[PDB]
Amino acid sequence: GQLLGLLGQAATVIGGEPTVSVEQLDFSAARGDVALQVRAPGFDVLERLRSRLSESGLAVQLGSASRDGSTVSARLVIGG
Amino acid sequence: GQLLGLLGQAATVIGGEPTVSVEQLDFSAARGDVALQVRAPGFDVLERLRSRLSESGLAVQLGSASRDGSTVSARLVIGG
Ligand SMILES: [Br-]
Ligand SMILES: [Br-]
Ligand SMILES: [Br-]
Ligand SMILES: [Br-]
Ligand SMILES: [Br-]
Ligand SMILES: [Br-]
16 A cells, blocks of 8 residues: 555655646556646646656656647556 | 645655555545545544644545444545
């Protein structure tokens, strides 16, 4: 039982990004992962966030991205 | 936009409790709160966790508790 700590680290890293907002999350104790629906100004900020999460030791996948107006929405799955 | 940081602090505090497991959570960016379905050995551990969360500066409510076998299930709502 450590997954909520993973969301802790992700919370620090994502908190370090002013341009990113977390619209949704899907915490699955069964699957052993947590999904974050996040929004950013562009895809490069999203890749910066995935890189920072991966460098902090977390297993992270970034996908399901699409631009909607002035922002881009994507899914960051933390956990392995 | 600071609610995910609230889940960060709650993640530290709850991580400091070996007897407590987080079975569910309900992250509501709209309502400005997050709900945690947690399990513990007894109600006193639950009140210890609510007290530690409240003392760390978080607004927390503990309720909807019921014993089911050897453990007790309850709802901790963080956010105000
Ligand atoms: Br946010
Ligand atoms: Br871009
Ligand atoms: Br991980
Ligand atoms: Br846990
Ligand atoms: Br008790
Ligand atoms: Br709060």
